[PDB]
A = this chain, B = another copy of it.
Amino acid sequence: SPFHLNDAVAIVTGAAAGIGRAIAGTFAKAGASVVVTDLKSEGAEAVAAAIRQAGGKAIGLECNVTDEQHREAVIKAALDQFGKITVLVNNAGGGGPKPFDMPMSDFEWAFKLNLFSLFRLSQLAAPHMQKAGGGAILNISSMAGENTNVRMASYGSSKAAVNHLTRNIAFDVGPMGIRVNAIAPGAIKLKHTPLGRLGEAQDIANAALFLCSPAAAWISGQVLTVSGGG
């Protein structure tokens, strides 16, 4: 009941497949109007169309989240179509194991893709959420942001930066009625996975729905790890 998104307008990035795909469709089924975005325009349009055939409201848009014009086009299309913005899910991102001596452009790209993009989209969405009376921002981070390992210089540090960004900008945007959280997903489809199975995208999507819903109205600044206990 407070776990619903009635009258919500949710922007979702990286939503052609996987976690972002499940978040888009789950948010629609919970009552949100969904602006489905992806690097691949065709994949975003497919998920948007699939959402419309199931009874929800959605449009599909191409968005390279590291492209300032793509970002602004997403913002405008949300407003032109649905009139406001109350939910932003920064799911687009990536990277992985790299050697310590990787080229600097690789190190710097992890931060542009995983951190600079979202921070900017949060900047763009925040005033509009404030005018709508409040909002929730959800960043999809990674377990490497809290873990320590080889080959994690760019991936672990940039996702760490996403985590502490979440914690800090909650102070900045709380007074505007905006909550900011993050989910750290485990591996999604075992000897160090207590619950004994891999994750499902729906698992991340359910946690996302809670954190973006009025059921989490007083939850901000949090990094929730969804990883079967490992």
Contact = CB atoms under 8 A, between A and B. Distances in A.
Contacts of A228: 174, 218, 220
A50 B221 CA distance: 35
Copies of this chain, whole number: 2
Nearest to A192: B171
Contact of A218 (B171, B218, B226): B226
Contacts of A175: 194, 196
A97 to B, nearest CB: 24
Contacts of A173: 194
A203 B200 CA distance: 27
Give the interface size bracket for A toward B. 35 or more
Contacts of A216: 206-207, 210
A177 B194 CA distance: 9
11 contacts: A174-B196, A175-B196, A177-B195, A179-B195, A199-B218, A206-B215, A206-B216, A210-B210, A210-B216, A219-B226, A221-B227
